[model samples]
Each structure stands twice: as structure tokens, then as C-alpha cells.
Target: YFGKLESKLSVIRNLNDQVLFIDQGNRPLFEDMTDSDSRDNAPRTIFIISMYKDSQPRGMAVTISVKSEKISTLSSENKIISFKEMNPPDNIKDTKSDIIFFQRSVPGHDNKMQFESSSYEGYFLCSEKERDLFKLILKKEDELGDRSCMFTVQNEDG
Candidate 1:
């Protein structure tokens, strides 16, 4: 949990065992490591992970931001970011403005984390099993398979 603040960590796709990086279009592209094994095998994209706010017992609340190039300088305006609870329930609006998310560390076992979108119902950050090149979209958590939702978190130095 050293990522609680001021930590740089890369998000790896647990499904294909590849690193995720933000393309110039702000799209996430998975690392196609092979001969690049000498390329260090680390993700080109490192995230400046930090606690965005408090969390529920369901998970740790945090912000996952790119550590490379100033995004504000982008012409396409690529931005990403995500909070809380009550008995009344709620809805999800992805402005990519709210970065706070429920980083759930369970159901996959090991150093796995399942992220549920803040202020949204039945939404969890997910990726395609085959297409590892799309922007991550929040999906219907329980309806999707665990493999699509599960992920491993690690120190950037890993």
C-alpha cells in the first residue's frame, strides 16, 4: 500500500500479463513484450498513485494519474480521474473528471485489485480479454467474468 501517496506504479493487465500504457490518443495499449524483454519489460506508462480520499470497507479509495507528459497540454483533451455511500443508492457519470475510485483488493486472491467506479452502481473498471488496446470502460461488475475485472498492483520498481 505504499501507493497511498507519492508512489509510481504501473498497471499491468492481469489477463494477458502485459503492461498498460496511455497512447498519444489517451487510449490504453498493452505491452506486447517479446524481444522487448531487453527493453526492460516495464510499462512505458507509470502512474503517480495517491489516496484521493477515505474509503469504504469494500476497498481503498485512490487516484490513478499518468506520471508522464503533461496531459493538460494535450490537444485532444485526454483526462482521467474518479467517491461514497448510503442506503439510497446512486448513479455514475464519467466526466473522467472524478478520479476517486473504490480500489477493491479481493475476489482474485494474491495482490489483485478490482476497481468499482465511485458514485456509480454496478460499475467496475474493466478491459476486453482480447482487445487490450481500448480505453478502459467501467462495466457491469457482477455480469462480467472475473478475469476481465481482476488486476495486479505492484511497485513501479517491479
Candidate 2:
């Protein structure tokens, strides 16, 4: 199996370089590095992804807070649940198996990728161009025609 792979993801077309962030309520958003300039910081744009040695192209379990909170769904709603830091190192009584995503590399680009949910199949992580704080939700791949589903992933966990 692959070890913990930590990375940050930002929409490819975002001008300000907003990154994927999980909030206090366990919701997902593409947000700036900080909420404001009071010196406090928003939660870091980090994800610890786990994939089998041979299945990296098919699916991987992605967890924020390292091995803790996971961006997940009970359905293809307007929201994704991290079940943030639930603390028992356990799961809640909903859904099944694991919340997994397929990291599909862009056909022509090295740094670009697409996050397609294995748990919520056929849906891709998408948001409108240049839109931050918009609920980072999944839409059908067809719906992605007018939205931004491409992301640039960085291995910046140092």
C-alpha cells in the first residue's frame, strides 16, 4: 500500500490561488490561506491520501487532518462531510466502506488533476470559475462543461 500522501489542491483557473479547506463544521470550501489579517489562520490546505500500491488510478481514501476527518458524502448533495476530527478514530453510522476519490490526471498536463468520487461515482469536484467560498460540491461530469473541475495539486507539506 502507498503511505500517506499529503498535498494541497487549488482550482486551476482560480486567480487568487484559493485552496481546498475544511472548516469547523466539517464542510469543504475553496478558501484563501487565511480568513483575515488578524494573524489567525484558516485550517491548512492539506490532505492525507491513501491508495493501494496498484489502485492509485482507480480510487484512494482522502482525509483531511491527516488520517482523521475525511471529505465524504452520504449523497451527491451540495455538501461534503469531513466528519471532522470525530476523535475515536472511528466512523459514524452512515454510509459504508470508505469515502474514496479517483485522482485522474489531465490528459495533457502534469500538474493538473481531477477528483472524481468513487464513493459518489460519476460526480466530480467542481465549482464555478474564480468562485471562492462556494460550496465545493460534486456534479456530474457532463455538468462540468461550464464549471471548473480541473485542479492543480502541489506536494507542499513541508
Candidate number of the best TM-score:
1
lDDT of each: 0.50, 0.48
Instruction: Report per-prediction Cα RMSD to one decimal.
Output: 8.3, 6.0
> Which candidate's lDDT is highest?
1
Span of 10 residues, lowest total lDDT, candidate 1: 81-90
Query: Positional deviation of 112 in candidate 1, in angstroms?
Result: 1.5
- lDDT by residue (41-137, candidate 2, tens digit) is 2333455444322233454444333332344332333335344332222332333223445666666665566767655666776754334455566
Regions more than 4 Å wrong, model 2:
1-16, 33-39, 54-98, 128-132, 143-147
Error of 1 at 52 (Å): 3.9
Across 1-158, the per-residue lDDT of candidate 1 in tens digits comes to 11233434555565656566665555555665553542543444565555533423346655566634342211112223211111111222343224456777665575777776555645776656445343455566657456767777777576
Mark the regions of model 1 whose C-alpha exceeds 4 Å error after superposition.
1-6, 35-43, 53-57, 71-97, 129-135
